[PDB]
Design a protein around this ligand. Structure first.
Ligand SMILES: Nc1ncnc2c1ncn2[C@@H]1O[C@H](COP(=O)(O)OP(=O)(O)OP(=O)(O)O)[C@@H](O)[C@H]1O
Ligand SMILES: Nc1ncnc2c1ncn2[C@@H]1O[C@H](COP(=O)(O)OP(=O)(O)O)[C@@H](O)[C@H]1O
Ligand SMILES: [Mg+2]
Ligand SMILES: [Mg+2]
Ligand SMILES: [Zn+2]
Lengths: 21, 664, 203
DNA sequence: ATCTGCTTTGGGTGGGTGGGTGGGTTGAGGCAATT
DNA sequence: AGCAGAT
């Protein structure tokens, strides 16, 4: 429930993509 | 002073002194005041620019010998709110007064226009509230409504009687003519003079006729809830509105919701339920324009006399041919060749019938054969948005007769008839086929005749006819294995065959290669685009200004202005080849043939020699120039030669590029 | 008023992100990695359209692969019973429409009519496909446009239309072999092709 | 109480702005889905 | 020809 995306979120989304390879 | 000639004022018009709005409007003095106010609105209204809108709209109306003056609802609402309210609630009488006043305004500019057309019909353009065919209720009866649907059934145009005259069977006296209501028949039971209960014969010395047509509107599949059945209504199109809409097309109908008595409906239902219909007042073609809903007027590809005095400044500038290519799908980062091919196809060549014996195609076909995530479907969607008439089809969602034309047995007459398919709906337009390589072979082979001869020939169930399909095809395909193999020839990387391939003027092969600098630019552009498109990032004027500022960042020409410009160029300009270097074209064609002799190479035939000239004509058209220039021919030769070279294998690509450097 | 106070008390928590993941499908046991994907799919992404009418997707598609009897279907069952709009189906759909729409015409004169499929019925919802790896070739091809462009384009005899399919797909598949083989890559163990595999956000 | 007048069966010597949940039902031909 | 209506 935050209206601004911080790099910490970008890093988290990156991890999920990696695990799907 | 005669009491019948006195008039009230606007504020004195807002306060109602009757028991119903129709009775309020119908009164003499009120009607006089309303007519005066409508005339003042037509004469005095000025847009932001400050020039009269409807003076110009009347001048153009007279130019074209038309009998329809298009009026914007928003303009009337802002200038006169009470009149807009009256038109919304009591459309019949208000429209009658507005037709009389419009004829008086038109006669102001053309004193003798009564000799061309006797009456002028006012058409409402943008009614703020839109209903569905499910949302219509009793409260909407006898009030203006705006609905959408699909024209599923149409009837021929019949001349209807504008005035009916009756004569007594016994007395023999002839009653005076009476206005005919299209909704229901008019009958006379009590004769004024004879006073005879017997019927009176229908006869008349002289009558004036008007065109009449009926269409069955059906809920569009897009709006109907998924899985439910669609509702439908019947719309009556009177003169000047007949044949504007065609079967299988979406439309936005503005009209009057009316009800009448039906004995059969009462007999079947068991309750006194009436039958309802819509009396069309305007039609807007919603087909293939789902992305243009943010636009005023009944036509979004039409021009004023001032917008085509500037489509002709934009076009004298020196680099329009390249600011146009830039403005093609600006939200896609690169792919300059794809955008150039799309622009060429959009503008198209000039058809020519030599001596009435030889027919030569005048439209350009494009094929995008690329890798998975390379922005092909997005380009097709953009072309669908921008073209005047477009239809989108996907690989296995299309059939051989779904494209072209089919034959059915009419439910009413129980006789075989002919229906138009995608290519007919795309006449003078574009048919965009996605997943082209996954189509059925039978369905794919169906468009061969239409792609070259611009016609569909059907011999089925006793019908022997030939149609017209003057449509260009932009198809997206996926190479064998899902990823282009640059080491093999083109023929091995696609399953299509020589005849189908030879019909495509431009082949654009797209590859996805990991280059860190290339990946850097593409990612930056994509993320900036996603930031730009975020929803969060007078009121209408401010919204338009912010949208314009956002659009300017990525497109040198406004998209709406570009649509109007493309339509104007395709309608009014027919460039002609007069001065050309024959030797250059002949020598490039011979070189292409000799280099294409190799096995598996892209086919080369006379079709491509003609494609060069078609592309040159398209480039000349982009500038609104009446004659093809040498620069245009050079650019077309470059386009064709590049498109040919890119398709070669890696091993021979360098040699081919060196050999062809003269023309590029 | 009371519920709002509950909502505020929820956001103020600092473990909130972890708690929500642990609260998805409590029936299953010890698959927190999957549960995080499902929770993110429900929230979804922001749907954007460019300044020229080009639409950018905002729905998250998830694929789950595993050996038989590994609570694969238990995850789909929870979603359909919880998500507002959803439709549980299978790759080998019985109906004529299947995952996409089909045209059916009543006897004699009746003109052609569109019969909705799984992806159309789950509009603005989540479409759960129990056995993705067994879909029909017509739907396999037709799923290309639905997953990315969010539409189904049909042009058959007398009827042509674009049908909205704005749905998020949550599929479950079995390995090409009897069991997932650790030596091969995800591409090898799956019968799906590259264009589809690139259309799934998570695996 | 008498005089004036319409409409059947069912069928194309009423029709398709009355339709097929008002009955007239086999034969052929085109199309999608099934193969 | 039987029944539905106006003088
Ligand atoms: N990790 C788990 N947590 C809880 N229950 C589980 C778990 N793994 C299996 N089960 C139980 O296994 C039972 C049967 O498994 P189920 O058929 O749902 O699995 P599946 O992966 O969907 O199967 P299949 O691959 O054959 O379609 C389920 O009812 C569930 O109760
Ligand atoms: N060159 C590009 N510029 C901008 N976006 C791109 C580009 N290439 C791919 N995309 C992105 O890819 C998505 C569309 O992929 P799509 O073209 O539908 O795949 P396919 O080519 O298989 O049809 C869009 O969201 C778009 O933003
Ligand atoms: Mg695509
Ligand atoms: Mg299961
Ligand atoms: Zn009389």
């Amino acid at each position: 429930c935050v209206d601004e995306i911080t790099p910490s979120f970008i890093a988290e989304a990156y991890d999920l993509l990696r695990q799907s390879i | 002073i005669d009491p019948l000639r006195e008039e009230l004022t606007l504020e004195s018009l807002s306060n109602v002194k009757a028991n119903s709005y129709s009775e309020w409007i119908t009164q003499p003095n009120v009607s006089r005041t309303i007519a005066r106010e409508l005339k003042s609105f037509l004469l005095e209204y000025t847009d932001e620019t400050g020039r009269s809108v409807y003076g110009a709209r009347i001048r153009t109306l007279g130019e074209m010998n038309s009998e329809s003056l298009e009026v914007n609802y928003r303009h009337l609402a802002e200038s006169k709110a009470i009149l807009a309210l009256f038109l919304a609630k009591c459309p019949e009488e208000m429209l009658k007064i507005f037709d009389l006043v419009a004829m008086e305004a038109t006669e102001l500019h053309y004193p003798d226009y009564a000799r061309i057309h006797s009456e002028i019909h006012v058409r409402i353009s943008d009614f703020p509230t839109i209903y569905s065919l499910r949302e219509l209720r009793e409260s909407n009866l006898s009030s203006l409504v705006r609905v959408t649907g699909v024209v599923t059934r149409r009837t021929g145009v019949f001349p209807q009687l504008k005035y009916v005259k009756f004569n007594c069977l016994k007395c023999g006296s002839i009653l005076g003519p009476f206005f005919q209501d299209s909704n229901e028949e008019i009958r006379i039971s009590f004769c004024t003079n004879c006073k005879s209960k017997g019927p009176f014969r229908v006869n008349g010395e002289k009558t004036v006729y008007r065109n009449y047509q009926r269409v069955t509107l059906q809920e569009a599949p897009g709006t109907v809830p998924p899985g439910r059945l669609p509702r439908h209504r019947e719309v009556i199109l009177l003169a000047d509105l007949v044949d504007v809409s065609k079967p299988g097309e979406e439309v936005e109908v503005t009209g009057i919701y009316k009800n009448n008595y039906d004995g059969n409906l009462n007999a079947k239902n068991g309750f006194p339920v009436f039958a309802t219909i819509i009396e069309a007042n305007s039609i807007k073609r919603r087909e293939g324009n789902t992305a243009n809903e943010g636009e005023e007027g009944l036509d979004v590809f039409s021009w004023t006399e001032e917008e085509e005095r500037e489509f002709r400044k934009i076009s004298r500038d020196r680099g329009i041919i390249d600011k146009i290519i830039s403005s093609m799908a600006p939200s896609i980062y690169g792919h300059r060749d794809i955008k150039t091919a799309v622009a060429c196809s959009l503008f198209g060549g000039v058809p020519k019938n030599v001596n009435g014996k030889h027919s030569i195609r005048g439209d350009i076909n494009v094929l995008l054969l690329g890798d998975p995530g390379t922005a092909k479907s997005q380009i097709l969607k953009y072309v669908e948005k921008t073209a005047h008439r477009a239809v989108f089809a996907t690989g296995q969602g299309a059939s051989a007769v779904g494209l072209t034309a089919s034959v059915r047995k009419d439910p009413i007459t129980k006789e075989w008839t002919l229906e138009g398919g995608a290519l007919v709906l795309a006449d003078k337009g574009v048919c965009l086929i996605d997943e082209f390589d996954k189509m059925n072979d039978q369905d794919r082979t169906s468009i061969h005749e239409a792609m070259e001869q611009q016609s569909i020939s059907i011999s089925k169930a006793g019908i022997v006819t030939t149609l017209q399909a003057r449509c260009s095809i932009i198809a997206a395909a996926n190479p064998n294995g899902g990823r282009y193999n640059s080491t093999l020839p083109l023929a091995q990387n696609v399953s299509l065959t020589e005849p189908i391939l030879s019909r495509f003027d431009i082949l654009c092969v797209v590859r996805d290669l990991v280059d860190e600098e290339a990946d850097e630019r593409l990612a930056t552009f994509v993320v900036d685009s996603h930031v730009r498109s975020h929803p969060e990032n007078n009121a209408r004027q401010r919204r338009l200004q912010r949208q314009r500022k956002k659009e300017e960042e990525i497109s040198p020409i406004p998209q709406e202005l570009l649509m109007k410009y493309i339509h104007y160029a395709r309608t009014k300009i027919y460039p002609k080849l007069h001065q050309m270097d024959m030797d250059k074209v002949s020598r490039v064609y011979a070189d292409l043939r000799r280099e294409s002799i190799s096995t598996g190479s892209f086919p080369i035939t006379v079709r491509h020699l003609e494609s060069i000239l078609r592309i040159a004509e398209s480039f000349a058209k982009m500038r609104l120039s009446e004659f093809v220039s040498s620069y245009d021919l050079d650019r077309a030769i470059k386009v064709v030669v590049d498109s040919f070279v890119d398709a070669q294998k890696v091993s021979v690509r360098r040699q081919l590029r060196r050999s062809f450097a003269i023309y590029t | 008023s009371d519920e709002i106070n509950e909502l505020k008390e929820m956001v103020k928590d600092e473990h909130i992100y972890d708690k929500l993941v642990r609260s998805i499908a409590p029936a299953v046991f010890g698959h927190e990695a999957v549960k995080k994907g499902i929770l993110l799919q429900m929230l979804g992404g922001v749907h954007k359209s460019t300044v020229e009418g080009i639409k950018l997707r905002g729905d998250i598609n998830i694929c789950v692969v595993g050996d038989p009897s590994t609570s694969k279907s238990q995850f789909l069952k929870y979603v359909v019973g919880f998500a507002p709009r959803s439709v549980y189906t299978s790759g080998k759909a019985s109906s004529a429409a299947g995952l996409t729409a089909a045209v059916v015409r009543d006897e004699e004169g009746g003109d052609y009519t569109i019969e909705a499929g799984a992806l159309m019925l789950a509009d603005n919802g989540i479409c759960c496909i129990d056995e993705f790896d067994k879909m029909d070739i017509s739907d396999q091809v037709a799923i290309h446009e639905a997953m990315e462009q969010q539409t189904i384009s049909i042009a058959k005899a007398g009827i042509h239309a674009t049908l909205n399919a704005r749905t998020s797909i949550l599929a479950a598949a079995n390995p090409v072999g009897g069991r997932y083989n650790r030596k091969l890559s995800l591409r090898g163990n799956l019968n799906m092709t590259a264009p589809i595999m690139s259309r799934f956000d998570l695996f």
